[PDB]
C-alpha cells in the first residue's frame, strides 16, 4: 500500500495510492511556542500563543526541521500509518535544488525508515492525470506559479518559467481592495475570511474592461457575503479584479508578465516542432486555477498571442485542485512502479545521491 504525499506551500495533500482523491488536505504550517509543536488547523487555532511557520516557500523547502514535523503529522495524525510499512511517493518542483532532493530522500529513509520512496515532479503528475505525455502545465498554487512544458513524459527544464504570484498574493490583494471599498477586516480571522471570499465569489473576466463597465453601471455582478458575525457585505468588482492580477501583475506592483504571457514565453522557448502540441495541450493545475472563467480567458489570451491558425486547447479539469496528487496515486499504482522505487537496500548502498539517478 504505497502512500502519496504532495507538499505545497499552503497545503499538504496526502493519501493512499489507488484512491481517487487525497484522504488528507491540511495547511502546511508548523507552530512552535513563543515562550513541542503543532501542525495544520491545530497550529492555526492556537496561533495566538505560537510562532507559526511555513516550511515550504514558493514550492521549495526552506526548513527541514519543520518539514519533518509536517511529514510526521501526515503519517501519524492524518493517514494513521507506520511509514516503515509503506513505499512513499513524494512530489517536488521541476527545478527543485539538487541538495533538496537529497535531503528529502535522506529524511525519508533515515528519519522515517521508509522501505521505499520516489520523488516526482508535480507538473508531470498533473499532465499524467490528464492522460497526456506532452503538453504545457500552468500550475498555480498558494505560493508560486509555474509554466512547465513536457514532451513525451519529461519536462523541458530550460523552458520552465516561475512566477512568484499565487493564491496568498491574491488573498492579500482581495483584502486591500475590499478595504479600499470601505470594508474592514480586523479580527484574527481576516485572512481566512477574505480567502474564503476569493474562493467562493471571485472569477476571471473574459473582457476585463467590459466587466469594469458592467460593474460600474449596474448591480448585476454584485454578491452578498455573510461574515462570521452575521454581517452581510457586498462584493462587486473585487470579484473579478482580484484574479485579474494573474493576467495583470502590475495590480500588485510587480513588473512580471501575466500567466498567459509566461505560458506563451515557455512555449516559445521550446523546439518549434513541439509547439503545436504545447498550444493544443495547455493543462491548468492547482488551487489558484479554480477561478471560474480562467480557462476561457487563458484560451482567449493565448489565441491573441499565437498565430491565428494555431489550435489552442485549454484543459481545466474540475478536480485540478488535486491533479498532482491524483497523478501520484495513478503512478504509484502501476504494476510497473515496483521497479521505479528507490528501495532501502539501494539507499544504504548509494546514500541520498541515488535520487538523481532513479527519479526524473
Amino acid at each position: 500500500q504505497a502512500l502519496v504525499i504532495d507538499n505545497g506551500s499552503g497545503m499538504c495533500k496526502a493519501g493512499f495510492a489507488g484512491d481517487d482523491a487525497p484522504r488528507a488536505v491540511f495547511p502546511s504550517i508548523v507552530g512552535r511556542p513563543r515562550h513541542d509543536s503543532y501542525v495544520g488547523d491545530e497550529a492555526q487555532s492556537k496561533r495566538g500563543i505560537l510562532t507559526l511557520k511555513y516550511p515550504i516557500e514558493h514550492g521549495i523547502v526552506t526548513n527541514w526541521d519543520d518539514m519533518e514535523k509536517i511529514w510526521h503529522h501526515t503519517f501519524y495524525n492524518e493517514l494513521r500509518v507506520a511509514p516503515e510499512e509503506h513505499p512513499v511517493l513524494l512530489t517536488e518542483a521541476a527545478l527543485n535544488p539538487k541538495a533538496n532532493r537529497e535531503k528529502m530522500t535522506q529524511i525519508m529513509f533515515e528519519t522515517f525508515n521508509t522501505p521505499a520512496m520516489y520523488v516526482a515532479i508535480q507538473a508531470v503528475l498533473s499532465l499524467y492525470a490528464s492522460g497526456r505525455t506532452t503538453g504545457i502545465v500552468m500550475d498555480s498554487g498558494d505560493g508560486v506559479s509555474h509554466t512547465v512544458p513536457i514532451y513525451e513524459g519529461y519536462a523541458l527544464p530550460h523552458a520552465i518559467l516561475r512566477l512568484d504570484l499565487a493564491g496568498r498574493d491574491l488573498t492579500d490583494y482581495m483584502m486591500k481592495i475590499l478595504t479600499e471599498r470601505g470594508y474592514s477586516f480586523t479580527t484574527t480571522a481576516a485572512a481566512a475570511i477574505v480567502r474564503d471570499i476569493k474562493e467562493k465569489l471571485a472569477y476571471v473576466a473574459l473582457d476585463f474592461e467590459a466587466e469594469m463597465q458592467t460593474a460600474a453601471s449596474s448591480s448585476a455582478l454584485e454578491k452578498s457575503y455573510e461574515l462570521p458575525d452575521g454581517q452581510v457585505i457586498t462584493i462587486g468588482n473585487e470579484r473579478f479584479r482580484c484574479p485579474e492580477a494573474l493576467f495583470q501583475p502590475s495590480f500588485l506592483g510587480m513588473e512580471s508578465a501575466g500567466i498567459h504571457e509566461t505560458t506563451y514565453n515557455s512555449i516559445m522557448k521550446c523546439d518549434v516542432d513541439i509547439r503545436k502540441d504545447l498550444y493544443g495541450n495547455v493543462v491548468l493545475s492547482g488551487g489558484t486555477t479554480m477561478f471560474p472563467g480562467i480557462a476561457d480567458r487563458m484560451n482567449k489570451e493565448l489565441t491573441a498571442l499565437a498565430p491565428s491558425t494555431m489550435k489552442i486547447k485549454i484543459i481545466a479539469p474540475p478536480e485540478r485542485k488535486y491533479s498532482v496528487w491524483i497523478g501520484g496515486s495513478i503512478l504509484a499504482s502501476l504494476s510497473t512502479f515496483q521497479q521505479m522505487w528507490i528501495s532501502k537496500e539501494e539507499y544504504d548502498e548509494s546514500g541520498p545521491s541515488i535520487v538523481h539517478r532513479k527519479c526524473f
Binding site: 489507488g18 484512491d19 481517487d20 499532465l127 499524467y128 492525470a129 490528464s130 492522460g131 497526456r132 505525455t133 506532452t134 513525451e152 513524459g153 519529461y154 491524483i326 497523478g327 496515486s329 495513478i330 503512478l331 499504482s333 502501476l334 504494476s335 510497473t336 521497479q339
Partner: protein, 123 residues
C-alpha cells in the same frame, strides 16, 4: 521495467495491442484487435520495418470516451515507460475516440470499431 509485456514489445514488424486493466498492461487477444471498448484505454505499438530493414516504432495510447481517469493516466504513463524501454525510439501519439489520426485509423484494415463497456476502474 521487468514487465513481461515489455519483453515482448517491438520485436518484429507488426501491431501489438494492450488494454489497461486495473493499473496493469494486458495484451488484447489478436482476434479482437480493432474492437475497442469506449469505456477503456489501450496502448498500441506499431512496429514497421523500413527499406533499410530498420525497425521504427509509433506508440499510440487510445482513450475511450468513458474510460476512467486511472485508465487514461495509466495508458499515458505506460506509453512513456515503453518508449523509455525502447530507448526513447517510439514516437508517442495520444488518440482520442472520435478523433483518431489517419495513421492510427490506417492500422485496422477492416476499419476499427467501437463498443460500449469495459473493465471497471482500478481506483
Amino acid at each position: 521495467v521487468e514487465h513481461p509485456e515489455f519483453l515482448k514489445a517491438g520485436k518484429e514488424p507488426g501491431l501489438q495491442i494492450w488494454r489497461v486493466e486495473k493499473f496493469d498492461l494486458v495484451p488484447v487477444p489478436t482476434c479482437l484487435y480493432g474492437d475497442f471498448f469506449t469505456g477503456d484505454a489501450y496502448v498500441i505499438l506499431k512496429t514497421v520495418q523500413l527499406r533499410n530493414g530498420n525497425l521504427q516504432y509509433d506508440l499510440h495510447y487510445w482513450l475511450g470516451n468513458e474510460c476512467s481517469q486511472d485508465e487514461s493516466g495509466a495508458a499515458a504513463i505506460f506509453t512513456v515507460q515503453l518508449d523509455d524501454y525502447l530507448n526513447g525510439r517510439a514516437v508517442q501519439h495520444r488518440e482520442v475516440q472520435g478523433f483518431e489520426s489517419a495513421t492510427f485509423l490506417g492500422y485496422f484494415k477492416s476499419g476499427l470499431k467501437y463498443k460500449k463497456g469495459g473493465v471497471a476502474s482500478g481506483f
